[PDB]
Amino acid sequence: TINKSHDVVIIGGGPAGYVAAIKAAQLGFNTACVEKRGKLGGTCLNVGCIPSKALLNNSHLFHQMHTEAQKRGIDVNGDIKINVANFQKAKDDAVKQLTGGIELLFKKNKVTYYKGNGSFEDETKIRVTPVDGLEGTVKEDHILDVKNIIVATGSEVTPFPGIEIDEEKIVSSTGALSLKEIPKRLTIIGGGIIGLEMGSVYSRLGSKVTVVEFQPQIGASMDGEVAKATQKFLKKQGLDFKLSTKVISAKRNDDKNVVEIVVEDTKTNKQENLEAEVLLVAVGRRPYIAGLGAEKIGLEVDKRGRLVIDDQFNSKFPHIKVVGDVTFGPMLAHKAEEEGIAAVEMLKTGHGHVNYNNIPSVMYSHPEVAWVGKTEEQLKEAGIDYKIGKFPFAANSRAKTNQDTEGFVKILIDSKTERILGAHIIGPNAGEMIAEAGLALEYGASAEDVARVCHAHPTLSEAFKEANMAAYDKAIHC
Amino acid sequence: TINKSHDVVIIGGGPAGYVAAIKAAQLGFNTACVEKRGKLGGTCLNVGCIPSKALLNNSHLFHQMHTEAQKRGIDVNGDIKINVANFQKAKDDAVKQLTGGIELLFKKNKVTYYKGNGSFEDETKIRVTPVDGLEGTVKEDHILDVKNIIVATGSEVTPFPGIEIDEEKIVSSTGALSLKEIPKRLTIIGGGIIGLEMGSVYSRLGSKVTVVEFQPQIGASMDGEVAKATQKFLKKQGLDFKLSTKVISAKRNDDKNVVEIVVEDTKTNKQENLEAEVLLVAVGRRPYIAGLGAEKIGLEVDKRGRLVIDDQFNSKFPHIKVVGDVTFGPMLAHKAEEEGIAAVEMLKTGHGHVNYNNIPSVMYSHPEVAWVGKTEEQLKEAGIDYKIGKFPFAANSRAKTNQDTEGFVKILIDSKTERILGAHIIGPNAGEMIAEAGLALEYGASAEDVARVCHAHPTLSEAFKEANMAAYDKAIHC
Ligand SMILES: Cc1cc2nc3c(=O)[nH]c(=O)nc-3n(C[C@H](O)[C@H](O)[C@H](O)COP(=O)(O)OP(=O)(O)OC[C@H]3O[C@@H](n4cnc5c(N)ncnc54)[C@@H](O)[C@@H]3O)c2cc1C
Numbered sequence: 001t002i003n004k005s006h007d008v009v010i011i012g013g014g015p016a017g018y019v020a021a022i023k024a025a026q027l028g029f030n031t032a033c034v035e036k037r038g039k040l041g042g043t044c045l046n047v048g049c050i051p052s053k054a055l056l057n058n059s060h061l062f063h064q065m066h067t068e069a070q071k072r073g074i075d076v077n078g079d080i081k082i083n084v085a086n087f088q089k090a091k092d093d094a095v096k097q098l099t100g101g102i103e104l105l106f107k108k109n110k111v112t113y114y115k116g117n118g119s120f121e122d123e124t125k126i127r128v129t130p131v132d133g134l135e136g137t138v139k140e141d142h143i144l145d146v147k148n149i150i151v152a153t154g155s156e157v158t159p160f161p162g163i164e165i166d167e168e169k170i171v172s173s174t175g176a177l178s179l180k181e182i183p184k185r186l187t188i189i190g191g192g193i194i195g196l197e198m199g200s201v202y203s204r205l206g207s208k209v210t211v212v213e214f215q216p217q218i219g220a221s222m223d224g225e226v227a228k229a230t231q232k233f234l235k236k237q238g239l240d241f242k243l244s245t246k247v248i249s250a251k252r253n254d255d256k257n258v259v260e261i262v263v264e265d266t267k268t269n270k271q272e273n274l275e276a277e278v279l280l281v282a283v284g285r286r287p288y289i290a291g292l293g294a295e296k297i298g299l300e301v302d303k304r305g306r307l308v309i310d311d312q313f314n315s316k317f318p319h320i321k322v323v324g325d326v327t328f329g330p331m332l333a334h335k336a337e338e339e340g341i342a343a344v345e346m347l348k349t350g351h352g353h354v355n356y357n358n359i360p361s362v363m364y365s366h367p368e369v370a371w372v373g374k375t376e377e378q379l380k381e382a383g384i385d386y387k388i389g390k391f392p393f394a395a396n397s398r399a400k401t402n403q404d405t406e407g408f409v410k411i412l413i414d415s416k417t418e419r420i421l422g423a424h425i426i427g428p429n430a431g432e433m434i435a436e437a438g439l440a441l442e443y444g445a446s447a448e449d450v451a452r453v454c455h456a457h458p459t460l461s462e463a464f465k466e467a468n469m470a471a472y473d474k475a476i477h478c
Numbered sequence: 479t480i481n482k483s484h485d486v487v488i489i490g491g492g493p494a495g496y497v498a499a500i501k502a503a504q505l506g507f508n509t510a511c512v513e514k515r516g517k518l519g520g521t522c523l524n525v526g527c528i529p530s531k532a533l534l535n536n537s538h539l540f541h542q543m544h545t546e547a548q549k550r551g552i553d554v555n556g557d558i559k560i561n562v563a564n565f566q567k568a569k570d571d572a573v574k575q576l577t578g579g580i581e582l583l584f585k586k587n588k589v590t591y592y593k594g595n596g597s598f599e600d601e602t603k604i605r606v607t608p609v610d611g612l613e614g615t616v617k618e619d620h621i622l623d624v625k626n627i628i629v630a631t632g633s634e635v636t637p638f639p640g641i642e643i644d645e646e647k648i649v650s651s652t653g654a655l656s657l658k659e660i661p662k663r664l665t666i667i668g669g670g671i672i673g674l675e676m677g678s679v680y681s682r683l684g685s686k687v688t689v690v691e692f693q694p695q696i697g698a699s700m701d702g703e704v705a706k707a708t709q710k711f712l713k714k715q716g717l718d719f720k721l722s723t724k725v726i727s728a729k730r731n732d733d734k735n736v737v738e739i740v741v742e743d744t745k746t747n748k749q750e751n752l753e754a755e756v757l758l759v760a761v762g763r764r765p766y767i768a769g770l771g772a773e774k775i776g777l778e779v780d781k782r783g784r785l786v787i788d789d790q791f792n793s794k795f796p797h798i799k800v801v802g803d804v805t806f807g808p809m810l811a812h813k814a815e816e817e818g819i820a821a822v823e824m825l826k827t828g829h830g831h832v833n834y835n836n837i838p839s840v841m842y843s844h845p846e847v848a849w850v851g852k853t854e855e856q857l858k859e860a861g862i863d864y865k866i867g868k869f870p871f872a873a874n875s876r877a878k879t880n881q882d883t884e885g886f887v888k889i890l891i892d893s894k895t896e897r898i899l900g901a902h903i904i905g906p907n908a909g910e911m912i913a914e915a916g917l918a919l920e921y922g923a924s925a926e927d928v929a930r931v932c933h934a935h936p937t938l939s940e941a942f943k944e945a946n947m948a949a950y951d952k953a954i955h956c
């Protein structure tokens with residue numbers, strides 16, 4: 001029991017956490033960041049974003065060397081097999097450098113990193129419990145009196161009832177990122193972005209991937225047209241899709257080494273028994289309020305497990321702000337970064353805004369799928385009259401020149417104001433291109449305004465320019 | 479001779495030419511496009527943009543397979559060698575599809591393609607003479623009675639005086655595009671964008687490149703910092719630099735197949751006897767008015783060889799527009815296309831302007847260089863007080879994750895209004911990323927307006943956001 005005081009304490013060091021802590025230190029405050037696990041960055045830099053994307057880029061280079069190389073005029077005279085150990089080391093060292101860089105950024109901003117479990121004592125004090133391993137609390141058991149405290153605890157994997165996730169043979173997203181042996185068959189329960197990306201990296205490597213999902217279409221936040229097309233390019237890449245299918249059982253049959261799965265189709269209530277070497281339960285992610293002690297002070301949790309807030313990011317206590325994956329919004333690292341900034345700006349200025357309508361969702365498969373704004377379904381649901389204007393990458397100059405033409409840029413605009421309402425891009429660099437769609441939405445620009453922007457030749461950004469040209473008038477290469 | 483009448487005729491089928499033809503046709507005009515060579519696309523699709531970028535991308539993938547592959551966890555049990563014939567074929571197919579795509583578009587938009595040379599009879603009409611080995615060289619002469627004439631004759635390589643450009647040993651950009659074997663040495667005379675991209679291709683394939691440039695800075699249209707840093711990463715890639723050096727003489731020798739270059743350093747003048755297998759002569763590109771018959775009607779040409787126009791693109795004759803590389807402005811395909819569309823919509827509306835302050839310039843090397851707006855030196859001369867914002871790709875999440883951390887983003891904003899005056903990006907995807915800065919400059923957006931938009935995680939576009947953020951205030955990740 002050792003007592004210290006700070007202006008702000010951030011309980012959690014993820015995208016919402018470490019970002020809120022750096023911005024507060026830059027805003028004059030005496031900041032604290034309490035992180036439970038031995039590294040910072042949270043789920044995104046250790047179990048999320050950075051691990052999966054390192055795996056995804058390197059698997060695509062193995063895939064291009066196996067498929068595209070001959071056609072690109074490069075002869076690989078012999079075998080090309082993946083060294084799973086160094087494949088993992090390329091990913092681990094990226095995680096190691098980024099998490100080690102957040103600790104250095106804290107050190108430069110003079111944010112006191114408390115390496116222990118953060119819990120409430122009062123609605124003013126935070127008990128920093130020691131956790132096992134390297135640096136427990138800051139020489140055992142702290143209590144911190146704070147003026148403002150921002151709860152930036154994250155998320156955890158939603159478990160499937162009855163399935164024991166032993167991350168070895170029945171892995172979750174985390175188990176899948178560390179597999180030191182590539183499966184002959186990898187079954188995935190969940191058609192979401194996390195399941196689709198994990199399906200991609202291992203199918204490129206050799207796994208006969210199958211994706212079981214209760215919903216008909218995949219990536220369920222996607223535009224209908226984009227999602228149906230996302231099934232099609234992944235099915236050409238080698239992913240099988242068992243849709244409208246609920247999983248019943250899943251058990252390690254250790255005698256045969258095979259995770260004996262049993263599923264049932266929704267339209268026809270018959271059941272199949274499947275067999276996969278590794279099973280992945282990517283059914284979702286839920287909030288993590290455990291160990292924080294929301295029950296002591298009475299911080300409201302809803303039916304989903306999320307700490308509720310108002311538009312000013314605070315809960316029933318005006319000084320206790322909840323941000324990230326534990327609170328409302330799409331469970332995305334940059335959404336959490338925007339909330340970590342906006343919450344902290346509210347403490348120094350009384351102002352801050354996260355535009356929830358301009359939050360990009362990007363699946364980093366190849367082609368990358370990315371989208372901002374409203375989908376077709378949402379505009380027809382709202383009764384908004386809209387003009388569609390897509391442009392295939394097969395028509396784009398750099399896409400053909402780079403022999404990477406899968407996808408299209410789709411611009412949905414309002415028919416009478418002609419302003420961009422949505423932008424849904426299946427394509428190479430789609431996560432990069434949606435940034436252009438993001439900035440155009442923030443300014444409330446029309447399809448015509450970006451069409452009048454001079455885009456360089458040859459670039460993939462011209463597909464955007466001309467998708468917009470096709471929306472209000474006519475495109476040149478279409 | 480046969481005399482047919484059209485509303486608009488375009489003398490040229492390059493970027494400016496064919497989009498002007500497609501747009502005029504889309505605007506209802508009876509459009510005709512006269513192209514002397516067998517294909518549309520001009521210099522860009524045939525011997526420019528599309529072929530060099532195709533060689534730039536495939537050589538980069540060879541370069542990734544040869545150096546980065548094992549570190550990405552991909553072990554090749556064999557030998558990675560570049561097949562120059564399949565490499566050249568990949569380039570040719572890209573060019574072939576693209577050019578054929580414009581013919582499909584000309585049939586779709588009902589443009590009348592005349593394969594033959596266009597000339598001025600008088601100011602009111604054009605003559606299409608038959609060419610030579612041209613597949614479809616319009617039987618015998620045509621005399622088109624035209625209401626409006628757009629001159630998109632473009633450009634040609636500027637020959638270095640005293641050097642015999644044979645497309646075998648003393649090549650120009652077109653020569654180096656179709657080189658059947660990788661030379662042991664490649665001396666380039668011209669440190670611009672074209673010569674540097676061609677240096678990157680062959681340094682990546684096996685050639686010991688040496689670039690020679692008269693002035694003390696390479697690729698000069700660049701910012702001072704960008705040009706010092708572009709020279710540094712290219713030197714790092716294996717390209718030697720002979721700055722402040724002029725070529726005195728260069729003669730092909732076949733008693734030992736070597737172009738014996740003789741250079742001289744402009745400061746402390748002393749001769750050096752250089753040697754190479756091939757010699758790229760990429761000193762520049764000058765306007766091409768040959769065979770047009772401009773002089774016949776007295777069309778004003780300046781001392782630099784450009785066909786002079788006014789603000790509205792008209793020559794001294796008010797119905798004869800001149801667009802593209804043959805007239806004023808930077809010799810860029812997208813600049814040309816904008817001039818093509820503008821000259822055509824001026825016939826419909828009576829007004830049209832191209833924002834010359836918002837035209838990017840992309841070097842498609844790796845890392846890519848790309849800049850739009852005012853340079854630092856341009857701002858010191860104009861007496862503009864400006865703030866600098868810089869964010870390296872070493873601190874960017876997706877760049878570090880992809881092991882491609884070379885470069886930075888540099889937003890130049892005004893000190894008083896804080897709007898983005900210029901943006902200079904060295905890095906992976908910089909050519910794609912400069913389009914976001916393009917929207918910014920168009921809308922008069924400030925460094926804060928980009929820093930406030932929610933950029934997806936993990937992406938390279940976040941480095942743009944963080945550099946804008948650092949320009950007016952402070953970056954979160956550095
Ligand atoms: C190696 C290389 C790489 C390049 N890379 C890029 C790049 O990445 N991005 C970029 O923006 N730019 C690039 N450029 C420059 C680009 O090629 C030019 O900016 C663009 O092609 C200019 O278009 P244009 O319409 O004016 O004319 P051009 O494309 O030059 O073509 C005009 C056409 O006019 C015809 N013609 C000429 N005279 C007559 C006549 N009297 N009668 C009938 N027909 C005639 C043909 O000869 C010719 O093809 C590159 C150039 C080179 C050489």
Ligand SMILES: Cc1cc2nc3c(=O)[nH]c(=O)nc-3n(C[C@H](O)[C@H](O)[C@H](O)COP(=O)(O)OP(=O)(O)OC[C@H]3O[C@@H](n4cnc5c(N)ncnc54)[C@H](O)[C@@H]3O)c2cc1C
Nearest residue numbers: 012014015016036042043044048118154324325331332333
């Ligand atoms: C495989 C995968 C890939 C993903 N890819 C992307 C992507 O590409 N782009 C994207 O935007 N999003 C992605 N996400 C989602 C992203 O990881 C989350 O949106 C992001 O981590 C949210 O940040 P956060 O700060 O809210 O929470 P988190 O990063 O989860 O971090 C919160 C931290 O709180 C700590 N903590 C929890 N309780 C306590 C307590 N009581 N005391 C102290 N510390 C505590 C946890 O240990 C944790 O490290 C991915 C997720 C997964 C699983």
